[PDB]
Amino acid sequence: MKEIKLILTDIDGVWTDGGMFYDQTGNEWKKFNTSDSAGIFWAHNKGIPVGILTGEKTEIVRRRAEKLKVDYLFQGVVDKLSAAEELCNELGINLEQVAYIGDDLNDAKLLKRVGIAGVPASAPFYIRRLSTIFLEKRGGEGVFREFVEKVLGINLEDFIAVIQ
Amino acid sequence: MKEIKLILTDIDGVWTDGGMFYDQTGNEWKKFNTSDSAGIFWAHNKGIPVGILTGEKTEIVRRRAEKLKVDYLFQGVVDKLSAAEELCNELGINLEQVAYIGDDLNDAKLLKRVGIAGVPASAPFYIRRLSTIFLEKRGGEGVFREFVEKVLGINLEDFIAVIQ
Amino acid sequence: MKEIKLILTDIDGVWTDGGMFYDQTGNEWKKFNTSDSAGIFWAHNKGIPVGILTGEKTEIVRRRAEKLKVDYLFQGVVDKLSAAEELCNELGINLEQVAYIGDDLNDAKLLKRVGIAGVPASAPFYIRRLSTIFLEKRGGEGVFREFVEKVLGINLEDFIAVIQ
Amino acid sequence: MKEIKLILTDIDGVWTDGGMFYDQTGNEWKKFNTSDSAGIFWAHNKGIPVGILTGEKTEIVRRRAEKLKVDYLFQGVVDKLSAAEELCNELGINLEQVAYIGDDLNDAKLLKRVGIAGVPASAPFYIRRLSTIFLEKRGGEGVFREFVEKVLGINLEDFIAVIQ
Ligand SMILES: CC(=O)N[C@H]1[C@H]([C@H](O)[C@H](O)CO)O[C@](O)(C(=O)O)C[C@@H]1O
Ligand SMILES: CC(=O)N[C@H]1[C@H]([C@H](O)[C@H](O)CO)O[C@](O)(C(=O)O)C[C@@H]1O
Ligand SMILES: CC(=O)N[C@H]1[C@H]([C@H](O)[C@H](O)CO)O[C@](O)(C(=O)O)C[C@@H]1O
Ligand SMILES: CC(=O)N[C@H]1[C@H]([C@H](O)[C@H](O)CO)O[C@](O)(C(=O)O)C[C@@H]1O
Ligand SMILES: [Mg+2]
Ligand SMILES: [Mg+2]
Ligand SMILES: [Mg+2]
Ligand SMILES: [Mg+2]
């Protein structure tokens, strides 16, 4: 499929089902899926970097990005298209060489500009229709992994090669 | 769609799937869905205030309401119809100009009196039948967003206009 | 529906989906569903007490029981049939006048001896086949409410009566 | 079913749906399903030890292993096949007498070598195809219980015998 040099991803509604847990004390949680770490694995296996673009800003996400050895983390991003363009500048690539997955309004402008756009099955219809590949999985169900595997054309042969 | 001047909403079973998480220490959680924040976005985009009426009283909900810039928050409400009527008086509107979404016994009197009544798909059947519009989504699945988008007639053109 | 004078219930797998959340510090959580409180409402409306029999013993459940004004709470119960017999003996009640809902091995002896036995849709097949009424809901989905409404014959007329 | 002398299991994605909950303070949760404890019950009832092999290392799992009286607990395992072979050598059994359930890349080598391999319905397709028995349940839904019951041929007669 289309050649990709950078994989970018939103968090809420992609790495999660959109859930934001609040308690009585000011603490907050997100629920990640260990399945998604394999998306980082396949990307790094093919020598492709992964960056997170999120509108939120939390220690939750910083620690998760650390655990998964994500290459870039941008939090509190107000303009994701600008952020992506700037990062493309740094790497000497075009948006045409980027695969991005997001699920909501703040992702729309960037989704429309990238080489491959992914949107989970759980997303609003007017975002889902921006997706250029079909994703079966919902947010939090391992849809980041699904996206990476499809974008990179990971097949049974690739699997067999890594489990020797 | 009927003219609407105020959107009101329950929390438990609408903004959540009814889940109430308890630990061993007296703390408590709810799980919100980031998708519902777009309900506030659309309402405010159309100049319409949003109010929360809940029979619970928690810091959980105080914090979530603040995060989403909800216009009105009423907690520990014992009589939601009276509460809605009083707010209408203060605003110079009548219940026929209100859209309300709720899911259970304490919402029924108000559901029967508003201009547009919404009830999530997850709700008890005797409450569900009070709904005057069909909602596909369950509590916690983004059903508040679904309600707002339906009530305000948010369409593709409206979406295209905001992502420019 | 036959005459019922006491409604008894398990917690894990009935009031919850079986979920037991553990953290890194020795704390523990359960997720309840606010829908189930209506089960207590209907029982009390009909003048029927509710008791909890659970094999676990937690502050989680003590607090939840208090919040819902449950009439009886017995925790750390090893022999649920004996516990039920002893409670009923204090109240003058025959097991045939009891409705009990449970979901697992420790509930089977009691389920086989009560007037109405309920088992959630999510339960192991060997237990589900002991249910004497059909319950559509899974643990944590409001199946306690479902059980009470069916056992007490709660219909649209009862609903109309409480909201008028 | 074939002769089994040891049951081994992964945690994340088998005993859970893969969920990893992070808060703002460095704490972490997993959500277990009480249903899975019956897996240990049946195994011990047939005189068969159970061991956990997991690549994570948490107090969460120490606590859950203790609660369920699991015979062996190995965490931070990087090579599950080697760990299993070493354990087998110690017990004087071979891999053909082991039943193992896992869901992801780190489980594949061992799944290919055991006497009975189980993989939950929620797992990646290239792992699921390694399963030698059909499992209907997803991670966190009681799939460890399902695996044990199938591996040990637990039938209605067994159930009847234990509830007398
Ligand atoms: C070899 C491997 O893939 N390690 C991955 C593990 C396993 O999925 C986990 O140990 C299963 O139990 O998950 C992480 O720790 C995680 O999602 O938190 C990230 C890590 O990159
Ligand atoms: C521009 C915008 O829509 N901001 C909304 C964000 C994004 O949905 C989030 O940043 C996605 O990562 O969610 C909130 O913070 C929230 O649900 O907590 C409310 C806020 O109004
Ligand atoms: C009138 C009524 O139903 N009160 C019930 C409420 C409402 O369901 C809740 O206020 C909705 O927001 O829930 C509880 O507080 C609860 O489940 O914790 C129990 C209580 O008996
Ligand atoms: C007799 C029995 O099987 N006890 C099991 C209980 C019951 O399932 C529970 O008490 C239901 O309320 O679950 C555990 O405590 C657990 O999953 O934490 C393990 C324990 O082995
Ligand atoms: Mg998002
Ligand atoms: Mg409600
Ligand atoms: Mg139970
Ligand atoms: Mg796993």
mmCIF file with all atom_site columns, C-alpha atoms in Angstrom, chain A residues 21 27-35 38 41-42 58-60 63-64 67 137 145 149 156 159 163-164, chain D residues 12 17-29 56 104-105 108-109 112 122 124 126-127 129-130:
data_model
loop_
_atom_site.group_PDB
_atom_site.id
_atom_site.type_symbol
_atom_site.label_atom_id
_atom_site.label_alt_id
_atom_site.label_comp_id
_atom_site.label_asym_id
_atom_site.label_entity_id
_atom_site.label_seq_id
_atom_site.pdbx_PDB_ins_code
_atom_site.Cartn_x
_atom_site.Cartn_y
_atom_site.Cartn_z
_atom_site.occupancy
_atom_site.B_iso_or_equiv
_atom_site.pdbx_formal_charge
_atom_site.auth_seq_id
_atom_site.auth_comp_id
_atom_site.auth_asym_id
_atom_site.auth_atom_id
_atom_site.pdbx_PDB_model_num
ATOM 1  C CA . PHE A 1 21  ? -12.809 8.516   34.792 1.00 0.00 ? 21  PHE A CA 1
ATOM 2  C CA . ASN A 1 27  ? -7.624  12.481  40.121 1.00 0.00 ? 27  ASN A CA 1
ATOM 3  C CA . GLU A 1 28  ? -8.336  11.151  36.636 1.00 0.00 ? 28  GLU A CA 1
ATOM 4  C CA . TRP A 1 29  ? -7.891  7.872   34.767 1.00 0.00 ? 29  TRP A CA 1
ATOM 5  C CA . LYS A 1 30  ? -7.737  6.510   31.245 1.00 0.00 ? 30  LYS A CA 1
ATOM 6  C CA . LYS A 1 31  ? -8.029  2.858   30.262 1.00 0.00 ? 31  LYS A CA 1
ATOM 7  C CA . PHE A 1 32  ? -5.510  1.776   27.640 1.00 0.00 ? 32  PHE A CA 1
ATOM 8  C CA . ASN A 1 33  ? -5.383  -1.582  25.836 1.00 0.00 ? 33  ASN A CA 1
ATOM 9  C CA . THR A 1 34  ? -2.123  -3.551  25.929 1.00 0.00 ? 34  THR A CA 1
ATOM 10 C CA . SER A 1 35  ? -2.997  -4.712  22.402 1.00 0.00 ? 35  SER A CA 1
ATOM 11 C CA . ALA A 1 38  ? 1.991   -4.022  19.144 1.00 0.00 ? 38  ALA A CA 1
ATOM 12 C CA . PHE A 1 41  ? 6.272   -2.804  17.795 1.00 0.00 ? 41  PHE A CA 1
ATOM 13 C CA . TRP A 1 42  ? 5.395   -3.154  14.101 1.00 0.00 ? 42  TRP A CA 1
ATOM 14 C CA . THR A 1 58  ? -2.092  14.595  31.500 1.00 0.00 ? 58  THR A CA 1
ATOM 15 C CA . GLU A 1 59  ? 0.499   12.630  33.427 1.00 0.00 ? 59  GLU A CA 1
ATOM 16 C CA . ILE A 1 60  ? -1.666  9.631   32.475 1.00 0.00 ? 60  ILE A CA 1
ATOM 17 C CA . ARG A 1 63  ? 3.485   7.748   31.497 1.00 0.00 ? 63  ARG A CA 1
ATOM 18 C CA . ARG A 1 64  ? 1.771   5.654   28.828 1.00 0.00 ? 64  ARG A CA 1
ATOM 19 C CA . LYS A 1 67  ? 5.948   2.826   28.792 1.00 0.00 ? 67  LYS A CA 1
ATOM 20 C CA . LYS A 1 137 ? -12.286 -1.940  15.675 1.00 0.00 ? 137 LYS A CA 1
ATOM 21 C CA . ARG A 1 145 ? -2.791  -1.759  16.399 1.00 0.00 ? 145 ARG A CA 1
ATOM 22 C CA . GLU A 1 149 ? -0.973  -3.418  10.847 1.00 0.00 ? 149 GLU A CA 1
ATOM 23 C CA . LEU A 1 156 ? 1.098   -13.779 8.295  1.00 0.00 ? 156 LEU A CA 1
ATOM 24 C CA . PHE A 1 159 ? 4.267   -12.603 12.024 1.00 0.00 ? 159 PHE A CA 1
ATOM 25 C CA . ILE A 1 163 ? 8.387   -15.535 16.257 1.00 0.00 ? 163 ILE A CA 1
ATOM 26 C CA . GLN A 1 164 ? 11.207  -17.776 15.007 1.00 0.00 ? 164 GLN A CA 1
ATOM 27 C CA . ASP D 1 12  ? -3.363  -9.326  30.226 1.00 0.00 ? 12  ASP D CA 1
ATOM 28 C CA . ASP D 1 17  ? -9.782  -7.534  28.357 1.00 0.00 ? 17  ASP D CA 1
ATOM 29 C CA . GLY D 1 18  ? -6.297  -6.062  27.943 1.00 0.00 ? 18  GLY D CA 1
ATOM 30 C CA . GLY D 1 19  ? -7.265  -2.965  29.906 1.00 0.00 ? 19  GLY D CA 1
ATOM 31 C CA . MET D 1 20  ? -4.517  -1.065  31.718 1.00 0.00 ? 20  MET D CA 1
ATOM 32 C CA . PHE D 1 21  ? -5.861  1.830   33.776 1.00 0.00 ? 21  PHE D CA 1
ATOM 33 C CA . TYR D 1 22  ? -3.476  4.705   34.524 1.00 0.00 ? 22  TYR D CA 1
ATOM 34 C CA . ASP D 1 23  ? -4.138  7.647   36.841 1.00 0.00 ? 23  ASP D CA 1
ATOM 35 C CA . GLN D 1 24  ? -2.253  10.916  37.426 1.00 0.00 ? 24  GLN D CA 1
ATOM 36 C CA . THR D 1 25  ? -0.115  9.683   40.319 1.00 0.00 ? 25  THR D CA 1
ATOM 37 C CA . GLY D 1 26  ? 1.753   6.654   38.980 1.00 0.00 ? 26  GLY D CA 1
ATOM 38 C CA . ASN D 1 27  ? -0.787  4.068   40.122 1.00 0.00 ? 27  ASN D CA 1
ATOM 39 C CA . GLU D 1 28  ? -2.191  1.340   37.865 1.00 0.00 ? 28  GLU D CA 1
ATOM 40 C CA . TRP D 1 29  ? -5.184  -1.022  37.845 1.00 0.00 ? 29  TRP D CA 1
ATOM 41 C CA . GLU D 1 56  ? 4.362   -7.440  33.178 1.00 0.00 ? 56  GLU D CA 1
ATOM 42 C CA . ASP D 1 104 ? -0.477  -12.116 21.854 1.00 0.00 ? 104 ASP D CA 1
ATOM 43 C CA . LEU D 1 105 ? 2.957   -12.101 20.228 1.00 0.00 ? 105 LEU D CA 1
ATOM 44 C CA . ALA D 1 108 ? 3.065   -17.577 20.266 1.00 0.00 ? 108 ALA D CA 1
ATOM 45 C CA . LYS D 1 109 ? 6.158   -19.745 20.678 1.00 0.00 ? 109 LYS D CA 1
ATOM 46 C CA . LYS D 1 112 ? 2.846   -23.763 19.360 1.00 0.00 ? 112 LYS D CA 1
ATOM 47 C CA . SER D 1 122 ? -10.686 -11.204 21.318 1.00 0.00 ? 122 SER D CA 1
ATOM 48 C CA . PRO D 1 124 ? -5.292  -11.024 17.036 1.00 0.00 ? 124 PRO D CA 1
ATOM 49 C CA . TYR D 1 126 ? -2.582  -14.732 13.819 1.00 0.00 ? 126 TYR D CA 1
ATOM 50 C CA . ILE D 1 127 ? -2.562  -15.765 17.495 1.00 0.00 ? 127 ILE D CA 1
ATOM 51 C CA . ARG D 1 129 ? -5.322  -19.499 14.713 1.00 0.00 ? 129 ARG D CA 1
ATOM 52 C CA . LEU D 1 130 ? -2.786  -21.139 17.044 1.00 0.00 ? 130 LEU D CA 1
#
